[PDB]
Ligand binder design. Structure first.
Ligand SMILES: [Cl-]
Ligand SMILES: [Cl-]
Ligand SMILES: [Mg+2]
Ligand SMILES: [Mg+2]
Lengths: 130, 138, 135, 137
């Protein structure tokens, strides 16, 4: 069954979108958005409920105060955090990949704590139900 | 700016599962959620065609008995020697393995690395997360 | 300080260069220099005395094009995933790959795992940096 | 081609040495010291010839004491070329393990390691490297 409903997107965005998807080969906006929605579901299902999940927390930030804050938080979740990889990107940007495994609820907690940390510009999760 | 309204047709079953997740994520409504999906979609397509200078990570969770992800990676480490900065591997449990690689380079090549690694059989989940200058992270 | 005098046999070439270096560095004699070498050696291998908990790393160098050394390595690591926390793959050249394995566990088990890894064919070298946890 | 010579070593060290020698598997002192001398020569040569090397710096430390976190950031700035990446692992209440992937000139890699290791809070640590894969010291 198909459900029709309205949606409002900033004009400039809709134009780029319409252009991109016609090129790609989509028949219309709905076909293109159903695909975006299928991937979104696949990327975030892990959040529904509280099962054990594993994955990575990628974050970008720049330099000390935050670097010690990230460490201390890695100490708090000794059980869910396996290890973290730090790569010095450029001059005002550092890359941190944090490997985690545990109850989705604690992972969501660690995440919120990282993203809402002074110095952390962004953060993305690639997480899946183990 | 200017918010434009338009219709969409989506399978009910897909819409239900969608509503439940944006719910849990804390999205205001479907429009706000769909807007983000669209914006990220565009931002990645643009970095692609524009072959922008991106940095990031490629996460792969795969089946130990099925996937030969590591071998695949070691091969690529020679072609894209400049792109692949660091590789981390983790045996999570009896079935799941996690391979995360840090890449830096031109979007087209980096997307090439992702495409390959993600197509390997044995992969359960995986994604390329890249930024250009720390302004976006998709 | 009870000094014990004993003799050892070392190939001339090695000893010649050793004497040259020792002189430069500013050592007075071979005994002094060898004592230092023996001191660092004890520190690096103490963790093997007994069977307490240790943590540290196993660094190996191997040719991934040789047979299925990669699948063998991965299988052995998967088997001991309780002691293997994480691994880093560092590319050297088209054939040579350097991997560093982070581990934690009873010294005895770690020795066992390391012996296996180094025993694999395709693995050229291996080195361990270990220390007991706590103090 | 063997040269035989006499050496003077303090008694307690010799005991701990023989003790380590037995556990490890060496047949005799000569065979063990030969390996120590050879490894020493390989590291020294790489340094004076400031040759190119790849390797790792493993450091186990007390995160409640050491400034490691800081010393690393600082070093990750002056030598952002030789330092490829860093793996951090919180093992237990106290103990922290840091593994730094390095690649560059021996003298600089050596400086980086010496600075990080001579540090406070560091229980144990070592720079493990190879030039072309024929030797791992
Ligand atoms: Cl960006
Ligand atoms: Cl070498
Ligand atoms: Mg949330
Ligand atoms: Mg043995």
């Amino acid at each position: 069954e198909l459900i029709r409903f309205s949606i409002s997107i900033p004009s400039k965005l809709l134009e780029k979108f319409d252009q991109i998807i016609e090129e790609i080969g989509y028949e219309n906006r709905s076909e293109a958005i159903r695909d975006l929605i299928r991937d979104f579901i696949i990327r975030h299902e892990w959040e529904v409920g509280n099962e054990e999940v594993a994955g990575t927390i990628t974050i970008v930030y720049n330099h000390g105060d935050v670097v010690k804050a990230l460490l201390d938080l890695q100490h708090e979740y000794l059980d869910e955090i396996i290890s973290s990889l730090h790569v010095h990107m450029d001059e005002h940007n550092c890359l941190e990949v944090i490997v985690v495994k545990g109850e989705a609820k604690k992972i969501k907690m660690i995440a919120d704590k990282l993203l809402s940390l002074k110095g952390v510009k962004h953060g993305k999760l690639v997480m899946t139900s183990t």
